Paper text:
Proper operation of the pivotal CME cargo adaptor [name] requires membrane-localized Fer/Cip4 homology domain-only proteins ([name]). The [name] complex, composed of α, β2, μ2, and σ2 subunits, is pivotal to mammalian CCV formation, and its deletion is embryonically lethal in mice. FCHO1 and FCHO2 are similar in overall domain arrangement —folded N-terminal acidic phospholipid-binding homodimerization F-BAR domains and C-terminal folded μ-homology domains (μHD) separated by a ~300-residue, low-complexity intrinsically disordered protein linker, which has been suggested to participate in [name] activation, although how it does so is undetermined. We dissect the network of interactions between the [name] interdomain linker and [name], which concentrates, orients, tethers, and partially destabilizes closed [name] at the plasma membrane.
To confirm the identity of the extra, Cμ2-proximal electron density as the N terminus of FCHO2 linker, chimeras of Cμ2 alone with N1+N2 attached to the C terminus via 30-residue unstructured synthetic glycine-, serine-, and alanine-rich flexible linkers were then created, crystallized, and their structures solved at resolutions varying from 2.0 to 2.6 Å by MR using an unliganded version of Cμ2 as a search model. Crystals of a complex of Cμ2 and a peptide corresponding to this WxxL signal were grown, diffracted to 1.7-Å resolution, and were solved by MR using 1.9-Å unliganded Cμ2 as a search model.
Residue numbers in the entry: 158 to 222, 240 to 435
The structure:
Amino acid sequence: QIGWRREGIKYRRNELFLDVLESVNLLMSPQGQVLSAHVSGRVVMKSYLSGMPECKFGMNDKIVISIAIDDCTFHQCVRLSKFDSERSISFIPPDGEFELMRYRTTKDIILPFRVIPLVREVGRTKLEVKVVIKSNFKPSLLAQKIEVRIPTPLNTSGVQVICMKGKAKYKASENAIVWKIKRMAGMKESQISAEIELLPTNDKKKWARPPISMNFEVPFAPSGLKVRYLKVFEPKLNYSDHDVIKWVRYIGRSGIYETRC
């Protein structure tokens, strides 16, 4: 009697995979003040379970109105739990892959990187740029696919750049220095230096600097959300989550991650 799951599903091997997928968003001042930050998250499940399994998902945070999650929406299969009703939900899942819930958090976010900019005018013909990035997570974890984008003014005539890790180039048509790093461990720093030559191009006003933007991926959930339990029970087939191959992953990525310069 379940609209989203047929009867008779059978798998040789019962498996349940869960990905906590998060985008961390930040606006930060040149001096490191958090002006705004939030996480937008979703939980994607891949269910290869026989029969009509009854599943219970509990987290460390209150996800049903231990920080609270500002807002949360749930797949149609999700029901409120009679017990631990603020941190957990219950459901018979659809078969295969589906999105179990989406959410937003704003408090106690782990900011994986700090960008520290230095953009000093030298006369009217030159900008000296140094940007330091600091990774703020466990040293045994690696961020990957890191990109830093540093804007240049429209009167830019030339750029010289040297990065200490990864690779960088000036994309003149985009007025940006693009700095890419394949991997970086936690509690590290790296930096890039550039000299930007400017045309006189007087008769204009001051340069309204876009922020420095970052992209990255991190192997954790910046919200701090943690799965406390993932229960499965099928009384007719008589198996439970300890007969199921389970896998819980936490995957973080930048959303809009911007630092004023």
